Amino acid sequence: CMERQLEAARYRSDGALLLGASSLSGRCWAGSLWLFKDPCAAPNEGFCSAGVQTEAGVADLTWVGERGILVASDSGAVELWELDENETLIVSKFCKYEHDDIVSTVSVLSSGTQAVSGSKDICIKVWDLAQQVVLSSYRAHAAQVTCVAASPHKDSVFLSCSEDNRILLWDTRCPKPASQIGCSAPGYLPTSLAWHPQQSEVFVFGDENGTVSLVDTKSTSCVLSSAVHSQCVTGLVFSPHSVPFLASLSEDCSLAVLDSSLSELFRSQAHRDFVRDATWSPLNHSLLTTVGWDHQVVHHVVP
Amino acid sequence: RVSSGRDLNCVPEIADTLGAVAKQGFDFLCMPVFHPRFKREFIQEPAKNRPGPQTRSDLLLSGRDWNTLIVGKLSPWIRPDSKVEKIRRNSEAAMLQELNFGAYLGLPAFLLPLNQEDNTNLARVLTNHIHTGHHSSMFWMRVPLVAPEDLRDDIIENAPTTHTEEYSGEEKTWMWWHNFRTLCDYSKRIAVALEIGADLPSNHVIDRWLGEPIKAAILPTSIFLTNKKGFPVLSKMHQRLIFRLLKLEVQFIITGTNHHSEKEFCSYLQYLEYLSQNRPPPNAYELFAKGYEDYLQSPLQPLMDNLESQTYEVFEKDPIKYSQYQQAIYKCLLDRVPEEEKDTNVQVLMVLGAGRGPLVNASLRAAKQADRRIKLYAVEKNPNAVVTLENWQFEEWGSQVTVVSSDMREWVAPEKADIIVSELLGSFADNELSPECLDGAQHFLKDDGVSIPGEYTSFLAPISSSKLYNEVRACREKDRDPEAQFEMPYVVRLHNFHQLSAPQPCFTFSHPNRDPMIDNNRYCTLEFPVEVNTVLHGFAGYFETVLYQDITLSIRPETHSPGMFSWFPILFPIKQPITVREGQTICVRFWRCSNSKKVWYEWAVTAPVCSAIHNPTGRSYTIGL
Amino acid sequence: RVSSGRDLNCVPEIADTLGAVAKQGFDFLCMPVFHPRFKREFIQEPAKNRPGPQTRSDLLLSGRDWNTLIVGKLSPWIRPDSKVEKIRRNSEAAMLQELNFGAYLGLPAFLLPLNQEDNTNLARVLTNHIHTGHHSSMFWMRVPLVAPEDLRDDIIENAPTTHTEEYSGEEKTWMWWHNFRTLCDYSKRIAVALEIGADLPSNHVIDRWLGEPIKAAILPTSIFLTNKKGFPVLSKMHQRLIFRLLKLEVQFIITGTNHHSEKEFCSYLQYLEYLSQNRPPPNAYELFAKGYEDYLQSPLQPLMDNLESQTYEVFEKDPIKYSQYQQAIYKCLLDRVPEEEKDTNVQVLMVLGAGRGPLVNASLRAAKQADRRIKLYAVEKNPNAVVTLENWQFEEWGSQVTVVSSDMREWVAPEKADIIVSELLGSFADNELSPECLDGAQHFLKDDGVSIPGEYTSFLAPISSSKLYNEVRACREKDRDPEAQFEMPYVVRLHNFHQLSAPQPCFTFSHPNRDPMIDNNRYCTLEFPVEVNTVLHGFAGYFETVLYQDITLSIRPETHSPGMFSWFPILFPIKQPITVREGQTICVRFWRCSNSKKVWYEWAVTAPVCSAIHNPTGRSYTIGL
Amino acid sequence: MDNLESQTYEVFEKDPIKYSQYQQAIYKCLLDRVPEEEKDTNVQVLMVLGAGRGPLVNASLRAAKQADRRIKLYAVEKNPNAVVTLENWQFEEWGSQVTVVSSDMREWVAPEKADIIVSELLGSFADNELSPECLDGAQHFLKDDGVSIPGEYTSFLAPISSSKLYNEVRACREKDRDPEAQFEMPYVVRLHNFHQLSAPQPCFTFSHPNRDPMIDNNRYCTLEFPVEVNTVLHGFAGYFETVLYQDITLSIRPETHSPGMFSWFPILFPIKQPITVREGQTICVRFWRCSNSKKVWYEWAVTAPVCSAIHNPTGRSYTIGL
């Protein structure tokens, strides 16, 4: 049923766990979506609340409210699935092939009715999730769009980072909506983005060399940086805490939990493959669930 | 009939996908051999020990299918020229792994991207893979006609796109290729897959790829416009580019998803077939000439060698040339014999080099078209063709034609000639030693006698063709100079090349050469203005000839005789390609040298940089007297 | 379907004759290009100036017809080796003339007779013609199997035919050929047209032509017997010879007039087709093997190189070999585990060099055929084949098979093996370094463990094949020793060759090699009794192997495993052919040498004459460790 | 890969400055490792890895009795012809103090671990004699705090102009091989009639002992040489520096050349085609140190102002045997 390479793990505000997996080897290169109301039973397929098979692999996932699941597909498609009235099925609401290559990242904007997707076709697309159409198509980058991240509370602002060594702050209210920020010297390629949950104008980004950096948009200066990992930083997820922790994920197969000054507070080597996604529990704010390509779901308790 | 393929970065099941793309009409499929997102570790534990399988099985397709229908694609995360040493070494290992799996599958081609300026380590890994077991598989370097940086939307407020003209910068991607193929030492297994964007660059950026080994052209679905019925079409400039690529017999690769979702996908491909079935049709004889495109042949030497029967057959299968010869003879007969002497004056015509006698029949048709009397001598030193001449004479011609089996420089003529007629001309006019032959035959021409041709002139033009340069380079033979192939001309239907300057006259010969001291040696200096950035690989050679007055033959492209095809152009290569910047002048020197036994050409470039003097003392190429 | 031609010395009209011989069913026509009685003078007047035409025109046939259907014949009056100097020079000129007219026509072959011992000047003229313009046309030397002098009727009262046995004299015509081709330096464009008389010679005279480049066999109509219905047939010995020639895929030439005048002429040809449709049929797989006849390939090195997918596919397309392996594993499992322990004892089987896993499936079939439990390790260093192995393991095998991607000489086994199973054998048994690999794998074999194969032995046999010698000679490459091609073995389906002595064992290896100091180097001296006059060109190499007890594989011809074809024989050539007279002994020396990095073979002949030591220090051929 | 001849070792030994530097390095290391109070109790284990005819052995002895410290010497050498000289020396002069080992240092099972390993396995390009691999194979019998002399070495490259040397390389064409193979191999040569086009820059650096989890001696280096003259590039001169111990160094790099030392000539990496370089342009060179199980080789290419072919790909023209 479920494929080996776990790609995404997201906690719904009621504690349920959304898993997104792909088969990146073998005969069939497909993917699957799963909902576990018992998060400890994951990734066992037989004891899942819901599960469905997608036509292609899942490169990224995110919730759309409490019933929606937004999928970036290898097929170049952005898909919206939704749960049953009893949340026993996962049905395809739409599947739009507007990208010309693998859709690598998706992020739902603050309103919850619009989204932004990035892809290896170098393009970034703003979608209306109700009309199921592309509101905007921007070709601002010059290489594969590595990450897009909607601002937590501004429906017109988001972030993008690509292999063209550009970190772009986007405000769709401007004639030229993109603004290049970040290090004025050619730093290593940005690979992961995360807005700060409380400080509006602040975000962190992890690069291909293992460095996590804390940046202010107004000052556009690398306020701080730390060599957290030995390999590319693939994910950055803040905790729901009032003063939030920062979860950093890397292809060194390790999970790190840092503080406000990017100092190492917790470290886990439990995974034996790439650490793909991390999500903090909305019920136990010291419990952090990570998934990786070793088909392992790890629930860490964080001091 | 276009040969086309489908580019996909998402293959759930290889058999289903292959069947679908075949039903859509594609001849092959460009696909990844490992999952594009399946980034693999080769150094650092624990991910280094990721349990297999690392990709899908080779048993999923027959060996025939792997050999004919599948084009492997390099995984997009493999960056052998990354600034990070870890990523660099890991991408080296992964690129070797994927190339070796492609060779293990027997794939006919493998796609690798050139998406940045520096691909030195990529070239190193690919060159090491090429020299690991002799294979014939191709490597298609995916090179964009316009770099994405120069193609992005002007939507970055604090990083505007330059609106200023950058002539050489707009050609940057070509340099990306040119360096790469230079690092890989012009490997014949490395070709270009030119990717075409929605916005075409200036014409010089496109012409920068003339003469390059373009094996594929990649057409994204996003560049297609939409018509009334909703079918995908292309802009008129894109149609120009498609016609140019079709003249190169390239394979077209369709990439991207279906954005014309109302119609079937094959629509895209169908449009190309449409464009292929409505292209400007070629000449009727240009099909036998199509098979000769960029085919290198040693120049024929009808003086030193006896031509074969089918060579003469090819010479004769050209009605335009012999129509011109007949018209020239007709005009000359009307000019030499007035009407009142038409029954008293018998003109002596001598075909010098009669072959199987097409010029003899041309002379007869001209004589009874001009209503004049002629006496014909058909002189030919090739006794095998003399057999044909004498069978013709016994069966048809009769005593009107006297067949002479002798060299025209030795034959003691029983009488002097009113008109001598010959076609002793090669692709470079005098490269078959027509001057020497007609000089040896001049003494039995009357004091007012006419030679047809009366004049001929060779023409030279610098060309760019890395394809033809590599073809010449591949002509290395054992037991001779490793670079002798560069010091000899080749008769070749030049096809994939770029003419860098207008052809200019080289050597001119007139007949009869009534001059005290006849010297057929020549020294010529030519200055070719070049208004493009390019790479000189050699010089195309053509010729014009005045047979009589305004009756002429020409393979010079600007004045080419319409419908005449018995002469392909000639090619004088050079050992080393010479970079020529826009505005520079290519200065070439050409010698026609000789001794008692042989004639040869020597040539050298002297600007913008000097080349070696090619074929000194005829060490690599001579024309026997 | 026989390819056949008609030999005629009388062609009134070429088109009528060609149409007639085509209607009779012949594929081509051997005919004169000049009239056979049209003796021509080249020196002495007045006949030197005989008016043309000297022969008929080339316009009588299309160039296609000349290229495909016409075989030129030398005029019978041309005697380049005449004792008269006038006739000698005139025949030189005439032979050059006729050969040049044949080349002018583009004829695919030209017939020249060898009807006497001395053809030195004929060879000189032909060799000069061959080195005048590169052509691919063939020259068929018409050589009689029995000279006419030894074939005449004993009807000369004062000159009786010798009734005394002349072993070497009866082979004289072969010498006629052997000298000629030696004078012409083994030109690939010179082949044999063997003419067969009414009385066949002894079997050794016929076998003298084994391994010779026989392109045609000439059958006079006079040698055909007559049956009841009046149809022409052949004697049973002639049928033997026809079958032997059909195995060589020769073209049959019918010469002479119709002496069975009641029937049509095609009758003759039809008989041959009859003989061809009732020949002993070959093996079903011998069609893919027919295309490999005498095709030289470099020996595969599965250790140094990673084999391609289709190479493994060829390895697996052999059910007899894997049936033998399965039977060996079955017997070993029954011998190692008694019935009472069949459910308690799990045998550890390790496939060392699993490829895509045919030995793994063989082990599984043997285990559940022997009703015994096994635990399988599939060890393979080729990661491309490891992909196939691991897809097999995930999809079908399961945890019963553990796939190891490692060199068996490095792999730290988690447990010791009851049985190790491999097919690391080449055409010469150990030429793929199976001894070294199985030595490196010996430490994780149990103290009483079994190796399958348990033993293997190579075999050598001197052979005569001027065809294969010339094929090796043609393998000269630039940038290396001009004779390196002779100092390396070739895997080849030996076809047109003559085995000169019975194969004898060369090198033998046993596994496990429980010995204090293991030394896989070898020195072997072999004495081959030869009972025929012949020419040594190399040594065929085969192998036998004991997999387990009486379960064996063999490509040794005397003990060849029926229906097994995954191994062609090997060929070790020598630089210079060595004449071997009947009764002499061919003494060969063979070394198996090695250092830390490579293993190679050296070989030398020491009797009846010494050769150079071939491949010294592995300068031309090594096998990588 | 080869066993050096007797006169080659004789040339190696005819250099008193080099062995004076080696002796001073060993002397400083012995004084640093053994305090004065332990000078009679502590016997240091010194191992000459690649002893040749034993000049480093005599240097170690002179350093030991110059530092007033006790040493136990192992003279390791795989060349048995030089082992003859070593063992005649040992029987006639050295005695039981020196133990001669006739073995490859990558195979030899040492009876004890070494305080100091001493070698001169360096070529004109530092590591072109595979000193990294040899000293890696010998690292396991070095003590956890053991010292390697040399402790470090670094190669240096400099673009040069020499049509004379270019023509000399071109004349080295041999039959039965690639007509341009002579351009894809380095040459040891006392560079004389040449023009150095830019200051030498470091290429490859190796440290010993290489206490690192995954040792990888392969290298990829990109060098940018500013050229302030009109000239024609024909190749790259190669030199080396080495830190034997602390401030005791050897160098054939011209700017820091060890005065009076001459046992190393510079090396020359040619290129197939000369490259015109105008004043103000930058010569960009790429150098690789590649290897497999059997051989190590160098690949190099110019990428600016114009690209050259990648020279010696896959070691087709030049390899260094392991």
Ligand SMILES: C[C@H]1CC[C@H](c2ccc3scnc3c2)N(C(=O)C(=O)Nc2cnc(N)c3cn[nH]c23)C1
């Ligand atoms: C049409 C193509 C095929 C025939 C011929 C060619 C070239 C090289 C080789 S090498 C083996 N065969 C060939 C054949 N081609 C020529 O261009 C050519 O040589 N033309 C002529 C040369 N000289 C003349 N006196 C005449 C008169 N009419 N045409 C002439 C190319």
Ligand SMILES: C[C@H]1CC[C@H](c2ccc3scnc3c2)N(C(=O)C(=O)Nc2cnc(N)c3cn[nH]c23)C1
């Ligand atoms: C059948 C013919 C075609 C495949 C193969 C061959 C030879 C040379 C070249 S060169 C490029 N391709 C090839 C292919 N032939 C062999 O005789 C052969 O090598 N057999 C084997 C060698 N080694 C083994 N371990 C096994 C196991 N089973 N059979 C094996 C001839």
Ligand SMILES: C[C@H]1CC[C@H](c2ccc3scnc3c2)N(C(=O)C(=O)Nc2cnc(N)c3cn[nH]c23)C1
């Ligand atoms: C001085 C000149 C003559 C000897 C030698 C040389 C070079 C090439 C060939 S080819 C045939 N003979 C030779 C001889 N030259 C070297 O520069 C040299 O190789 N030095 C050294 C290399 N490696 C070492 N481990 C040491 C230690 N001390 N000096 C070393 C040039």
Ligand SMILES: CSC[C@H]1O[C@@H](n2cnc3c(N)ncnc32)[C@H](O)[C@@H]1O
């Ligand atoms: C029609 S191609 C030129 C012809 O002229 C013939 N030819 C060339 N040179 C001479 C010569 N010197 N004398 C006579 N025929 C010649 C050639 O054999 C060929 O048939």
Ligand SMILES: CSC[C@H]1O[C@@H](n2cnc3c(N)ncnc32)[C@H](O)[C@@H]1O
């Ligand atoms: C079935 S042909 C022989 C097979 O054994 C494999 N092989 C050869 N030598 C070794 C070795 N030393 N270790 C592992 N596999 C090997 C080859 O890669 C091939 O698949």
Ligand SMILES: CSC[C@H]1O[C@@H](n2cnc3c(N)ncnc32)[C@H](O)[C@@H]1O
């Ligand atoms: C003094 S020049 C370098 C010396 O070290 C020796 N040498 C090089 N490599 C090794 C090795 N791996 N083991 C032992 N001696 C070596 C050489 O034979 C030479 O005498």
Ligand SMILES: [Cl-]
């Ligand atoms: Cl389901």
Ligand SMILES: [Cl-]
């Ligand atoms: Cl050619």
Ligand SMILES: [Cl-]
């Ligand atoms: Cl071969």
